[PDB]
């Protein structure tokens, strides 16, 4: 699921209190034994 | 098939707690032996028949059969106690399924000696001697338990004290033939079929029983060990 | 010696995962390192026919 929503400039970094649905783009099958998780930058 | 820890860990002073799984087949039928090895020297048996011990065995060592799993436990452990421990049970399917070890580490008179190794061309292979010094050869039976350099240990094959039935491992089987003689302690293991896969020491072991170890199934175990040769074919 | 055949695993298979391996399988704890010691072998049983 993703949605873009105004995250115009606010107090310090936090989650925004505001209400945003989330719609799915992409269903891709998929059987894996998914346990952990580690993310990348550029 | 045993399923046991592959190195466990503990202080000094306290103690520590060791267990052998094994289905209804084995353990549920027979008894666990707990074997020691010392890194470097041959084993030596730790408990038999998870109720007594030998006499060279202090009273450090317990052993309890709860259930289809074998516990191990060792009041107030020191530095000596670091050594390999292993567990063995005669399935009923006729063989001798042994351990895989517990390298329980932390940092703070009759001599069975054999012969008969040497390295030897591939395909073939010579005889594996064995001897003993005024132990009763009659009155005991004897097993043959390799152990591959840093591998563990495993049952190759038995005779009994009465020098009639013997069996050998599932993979042993019929390209070995195992015998004795009406001279001096001794014994006889023919091999054929080499495949090369047979890099071990071949402990020529003194066991306590008279008959095979599937009819007493409760006074079976395996006394003092001996040096055992170092035969490496490699190919 | 086309048609293989894997062998028991110390963990049950997930559905829709497929099961390619191709090391040695290790008994209890005792590693035999490649080369084939006791109830240690190769998952690659191959089957026979006549």
């Known amino acids: 699921y993703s949605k873009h929503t105004p995250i115009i400039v606010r107090e310090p970094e936090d989650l925004p209190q505001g209400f945003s649905a989330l719609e799915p783009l992409v269903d891709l099958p998929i059987g894996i034994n998914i346990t952990r998780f580690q993310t990348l930058l550029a | 098939v045993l399923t046991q820890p592959p190195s466990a860990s503990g202080t000094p002073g306290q103690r520590v707690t060791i267990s052998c799984s094994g289905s209804?087949?084995?353990?549920?039928?027979?008894?666990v032996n707990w074997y020691q090895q010392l890194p470097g020297t041959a084993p030596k048996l730790l408990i038999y028949?998870?109720?007594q011990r030998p006499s060279g065995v202090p009273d450090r060592f317990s052993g309890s059969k709860s259930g289809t799993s074998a516990s191990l436990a060792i009041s107030g452990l020191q530095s000596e106690d670091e050594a390999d421990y292993y567990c063995?049970?005669?399935?009923?399917?006729?063989?001798?399924?042994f351990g895989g070890g517990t390298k329980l580490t932390v940092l703070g008179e009759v001599q069975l000696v054999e012969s008969g190794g040497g390295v030897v061309q591939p395909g073939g292979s010579l005889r594996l001697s064995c001897a003993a010094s005024?132990?009763?050869?009659?009155?005991?039976?004897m097993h043959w338990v390799r152990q591959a350099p840093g591998k563990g240990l495993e049952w190759v094959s038995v005779?009994?004290?009465?020098?009639?039935?013997?069996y050998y491992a599932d993979s042993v089987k019929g390209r070995f033939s195992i015998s004795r003689d009406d001279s001096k302690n001794s014994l006889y293991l023919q091999m054929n079929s080499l495949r090369t896969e047979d890099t071990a020491l071949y402990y020529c072991?003194?066991?306590?029983?008279?008959?095979?170890?599937?009819?007493?199934?409760?006074?079976?175990?395996?006394?003092?060990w001996g040096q055992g040769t170092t035969v490496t074919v490699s190919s | 010696y086309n048609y293989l055949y894997r062998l028991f695993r110390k963990s049950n298979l997930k559905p829709f995962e497929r099961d390619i391996s191709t090391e040695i399988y290790q008994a209890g704890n005792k590693p035999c390192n490649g080369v084939a010691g006791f109830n240690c072998y190769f998952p690659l049983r191959s089957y026979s026919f006549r």
């Open positions: 072991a003194k066991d306590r029983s008279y008959g095979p170890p599937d009819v007493f199934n409760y006074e079976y175990g395996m006394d003092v």
């Open positions: 005024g132990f009763r050869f009659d009155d005991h039976a």
């Open positions: 005779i009994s004290g009465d020098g009639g039935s013997t």
């Open positions: 209804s087949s084995n353990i549920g039928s027979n008894t």
């Open positions: 028949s998870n109720n």
């Open positions: 063995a049970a005669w399935d009923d399917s006729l063989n001798w399924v």
